[PDB]
Design a protein around this ligand. Structure first.
Ligand code: BTN
Lengths: 527, 426, 106
């Protein structure tokens, strides 16, 4: 049976992209061995992890019913379950997971799992760079507790089932073992739930963000923010929308204006006890009217309290950057305040087909009077954010984004009170550098990381830094200078280097100014 | 501070209008346009305003001025459209000069960076800030996003978080703050120093009314409103509700309803944006607690004079308290001052706290007079200082007993003989 | 070192390290300073090993810390005698009886 498992695993993984596009999440295969039946059960949710279970049908029961028995190791959900169990009709997590995936972003409560799987990849990827101990089993690589708000506004460490959030914000404290810190390092993860009142920071979401950031600063550990939001929450006072009457200048001809909006006594008496509206009694047209001067709204979370809250958390981010590590991952979109929250971390990863904007394309078209912009990606997509120095790195999906976050973390201290992590590198310190900078223009990367030996097909010419340790950021912005991270003998370092070749800066044309032109500017090196 | 020849108790003779205006007219004043003499006064002392960096990023105005003889830094917003002229580089024969129209009440990369520079420079200079905030938001176009508007918007926040002087934001009449432009100057950034005030003709929200109705009050809901308002539409809708009138009559009624409901859209659209505007008033902001108060324009000069005077005097005494015990926080310091005021003046006079003039005079008397009244507040501060150093002594010896007997001698030398007798006794 | 006495400057700190290296290793070994490998190894031995060699450099740092807090105590009482007799009691409580005898004697 193990060989059948391997075969099915490979076949599913190679065609996993198509199965994902067709929304094939479950699969079952029945086959007889030699004869004993076996039933393979496959779950293929979010496209980074494939789960395969295996059960035998066992008839050793007291009745004529037959049940599954697994192999002891990873018994699984169907252990001891009847073979005739019907198919269910979606669950707590589904119909929210489905919406999030329908928007091109991962559901929030799938984020922890991603981390675990990414860590596995990390322990593999770094095995060619350093002498690492044997990795622990996946069950010991990551443990987390969810951070929730109590009735007072303070944090509670809680262990509960996923999908139980009552607000649009979720956060975790995660402890995990990495190659550089195989004893456990801590991070705080904060993320938006795109499916809860579409995006939309409210006061409670702002409060949770604030308190989790405070926790991170108090412990001196990194803060990871996953952005998928729609900016500040807005609303309208619907309890008034269906009650008000217009005091017309000419009630028969409404096209000579109106003077005010008002409530009748029958409506005013039902809202005056709520402090939802401020009116003043007037006598007009022989009628008793309560003229509306201000609307407050009985519903909390839609009014100017969201401005304060937004500003509050913005300040927090500005502080956090100067005390701890802040990293931001953009998975779906960020509007307004969300963008600022990313920017104030100053370390942005942007997934393909996501955008950081302050104003939407539709709003700008309404202001300007014509269909200038078509997509929000024209305003805040990669082709802008990655070339103007806002985004440091681009990734193809959410899983790669999580991996990139962990990768960056492998270079830096576990806390603000710790030293830089050193590795036992597989690249000797005592060697020489095989690449020699020349007088003619050359790629700076060749001296930093090395190059393939141009004479032969194999053979790498070594550079200054440890082989494979170099990772460039902000690559297409200001290409006359190269910046990144690397390791020297297992010692992480920041790297600044200079381009000596001439580069071409391409400046796009603004479609809102039909008299503009795109330009190419030659930028010399060593300047 | 100067003894100004411009009275504090006057009113402002220039009123900001709804149409575009020069921001200088409200700051400094203008020549009276009716006559040949006669100057219409502005917010600040006559002749004290001095602008800097004038031709750069002309959508924002920054400078120095005096309010009642009190120097302040000034930030204000241009509401007229301006023309940015960009020259052509003679080293690139394929380049061209360009004119770009910049609207007012918008933050562009240049004007945002200018504002950051002003804030940082005045924080280092040592002056309070008076901000006349009238921004409708940031530019979101492709070219300003490419030119890094987001970065400079973040810099504004980082500048305000490091203010050490009073920062007073005032929304003038016929001015509004929308969305991104609020969250970067909100008082929550630096709560100890920042305050926000609004006029009665001010507005503030996340989205302008048009942007709100486009989301929450689309055509379907507009029609639902018309269903219960327009007598003609009501009469037609009720008539069509009668069962089995006739085919022809129902067809005619439906066409009449379609024409009437379509004809009435623009007027009920104006109604809808009016309704949404009622959500953006300063009454709501006052109820929710995002602004401190609602002010009148004509008398704002007097108010802000006495308020700034209060805040500066409070800063002096608070600094003294902090130096007496640097381990106190802000709430503790403010509570100490409030309690001392009540304890000295009496509980009946406890209401005299939200009165900037009266309390400023009291604070001045405690700070400026010596060898005389002797400033009871100074005595309380001295008590704090004494106990704080005592706690440090005890803390150091208790955390480290191994030094207790090395200092025990020196502190028993410069004492009275009776004190030495007590030391020996113990 | 800086935490032991935050009132030291950079030259003082570097001088202390140089002197301690020579005093412990010897003057003949004083040339072993402009040798990154050798000196890094020595520093590592002083920083990573405990309950053992006991890291003599840590003892010198502790001496600095002790004297600094002592100077703070003296400075506060001498700058402000009015509190001298409010703390005199508490610091004569958690002491040995012989120490109390010295307090009473003197
Ligand atoms: C005016 O009502 C708002 C102006 C917003 C910026 C506009 S939109 C298109 C133009 N491109 C750009 O960068 N700024 C202009």
């Amino acid at each position: 049976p193990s060989k059948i498992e391997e075969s099915v695993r490979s076949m599913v993984m190679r065609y996993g992209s198509r199965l994902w596009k067709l929304r094939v999440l479950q699969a079952e295969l029945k086959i007889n061995i030699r004869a004993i039946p076996i039933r393979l059960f496959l779950t293929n949710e979010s496209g980074y992890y494939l789960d395969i279970s295996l059960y035998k049908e066992v008839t050793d029961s007291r009745t004529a019913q037959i049940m599954f028995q697994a192999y002891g190791d990873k018994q699984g959900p169907l252990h001891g379950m009847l073979i005739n169990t019907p198919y269910v009709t979606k669950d707590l997590l589904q119909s929210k997971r489905f919406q999030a995936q329908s928007l091109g972003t991962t559901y929030i409560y799938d984020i922890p799992e991603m981390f675990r799987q990414s860590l596995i990849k990390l322990w593999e990827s770094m095995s060619t760079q350093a002498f690492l101990p044997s990795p622990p089993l996946p069950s010991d690589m990551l443990t987390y507790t969810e951070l929730v708000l109590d009735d007072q506004g303070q944090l509670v460490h809680m262990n509960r089932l996923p999908g139980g959030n009552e607000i649009g914000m979720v956060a975790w404290k995660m402890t995990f073992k990495s190659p550089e810190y195989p004893e456990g390092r801590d991070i705080i993860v904060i993320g938006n739930d795109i499916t809860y009142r579409i995006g939309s920071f409210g006061p409670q979401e702002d409060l949770l963000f604030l308190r989790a950031s405070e926790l991170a600063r108090a412990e001196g550990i990194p803060r990871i923010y996953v952005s998928a939001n729609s900016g500040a929450r807005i609303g309208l006072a619907e309890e008034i929308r269906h009650m008000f009457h217009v005091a017309w200048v000419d009630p028969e001809d409404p096209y000579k204006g109106y003077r005010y909006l008002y409530l009748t006594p029958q409506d005013y008496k039902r809202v005056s006890a709520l402090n939802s509206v401020h009116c003043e009694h007037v006598e007009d047209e022989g009628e008793s009217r309560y003229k509306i001067t201000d609307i407050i709204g009985k519903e909390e979370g839609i009014g100017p309290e969201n401005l304060r809250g937004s500003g509050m958390i913005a300040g927090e981010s500005s502080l956090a950057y100067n005390e701890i590590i802040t990293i931001s991952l953009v998975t779906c979109r960020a509007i307004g305040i969300g963008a600022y929250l990313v920017r104030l971390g100053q370390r942005t990863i942007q997934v393909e087909n996501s955008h950081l904007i302050l104003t939407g394309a539709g709003a700008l078209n309404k202001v300007l009077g014509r269909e200038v912009y078509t997509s929000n990606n024209q305003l805040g997509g990669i082709q802008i954010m990655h070339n103007n120095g806002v985004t440091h790195c681009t990734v193809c999906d959410d899983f790669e984004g999580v991996f990139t976050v962990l990768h960056w973390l492998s270079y830096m201290p576990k806390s603000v009170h710790s030293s830089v992590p050193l590795l036992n590198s597989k690249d000797p310190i005592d060697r020489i550098i095989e690449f020699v900078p020349t007088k003619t223009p050359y790629d700076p990367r060749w001296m930093l990381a090395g190059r393939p030996h141009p004479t032969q097909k194999g053979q790498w010419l070594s550079g200054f830094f440890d082989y494979g340790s170099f990772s460039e950021i902000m690559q297409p912005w200001a290409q006359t200078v190269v910046v990144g991270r690397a390791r020297l003998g297992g010692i992480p370092v920041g790297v600044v280097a200079v381009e000596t070749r001439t580069v071409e800066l391409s400046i796009p044309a603004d479609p809102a100014n039909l008299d503009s032109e795109a330009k190419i500017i030659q930028q010399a090196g060593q300047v | 501070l100067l003894n100004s020849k411009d009275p504090i108790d006057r009113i402002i003779e220039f009123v900001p209008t709804k149409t575009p205006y020069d921001p200088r007219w409200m700051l400094a004043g203008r020549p009276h346009p009716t006559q040949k003499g006669q100057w219409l006064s502005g917010f600040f002392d006559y002749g004290s305003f001095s602008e800097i960096m004038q031709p750069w990023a002309q959508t924002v105005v920054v400078g120095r001025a005096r309010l009642g003889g009190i120097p302040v830094g000034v930030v204000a917003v241009e509401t007229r459209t301006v023309e940015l002229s960009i020259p052509a580089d003679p080293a690139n024969l394929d380049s061209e000069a360009k004119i770009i129209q910049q609207a007012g009440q918008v933050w562009f990369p240049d004007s945002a960076f200018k504002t950051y520079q002003a804030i940082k420079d005045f924080n280092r200079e040592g002056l309070p800030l008076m901000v006349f905030a009238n921004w409708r938001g940031f530019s979101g176009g492709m070219k300003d996003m490419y030119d890094q508007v987001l970065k400079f918007g973040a810099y504004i926040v980082d500048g305000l978080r490091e203010c050490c002087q009073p920062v007073l934001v005032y929304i003038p009449p016929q001015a509004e703050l929308r969305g991104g432009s609020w969250v970067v100057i909100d008082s929550s950034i630096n709560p100890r120093h920042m305050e926000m005030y609004a006029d009665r003709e001010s507005r503030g929200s996340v989205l302008e009314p048009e942007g709100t109705v486009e989301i929450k009050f689309r055509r379907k809901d507009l029609v639902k409103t018309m269903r219960r308002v327009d007598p003609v539409y009501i009469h037609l809708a009720e008539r069509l509700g009668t069962p089995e009138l006739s085919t022809a009559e129902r067809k005619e009624l439906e066409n009449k309803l379609k024409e009437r409901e379509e004809f009435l859209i623009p007027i009920y659209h104006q109604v809808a944006v009016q309704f949404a505007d009622l959500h953006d008033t300063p009454g709501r902001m006052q109820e929710k607690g995002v602004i401190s108060d609602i002010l009148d324009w004509k008398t704002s000069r007097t108010f802000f004079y006495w308020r700034l005077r209060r805040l500066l005097l409070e800063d002096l005494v608070k600094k003294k308290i902090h130096n007496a015990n640097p381990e106190l926080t802000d709430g503790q310091i403010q509570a100490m001052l409030r309690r001392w005021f009540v304890e000295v003046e009496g509980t009946v006079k406890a209401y005299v706290w939200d009165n900037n003039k009266d309390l400023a005079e009291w604070l001045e008397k405690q700070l400026t007079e010596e060898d005389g009244v002797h400033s009871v507040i100074e005595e309380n501060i001295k008590c704090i200082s004494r106990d704080y150093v005592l706690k440090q002594i005890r803390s150091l010896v208790q955390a480290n007993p191994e030094v207790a007997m090395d200092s025990i001698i020196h502190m028993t030398q410069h004492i009275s003989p009776t004190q030495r007798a007590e030391v020996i006794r113990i």
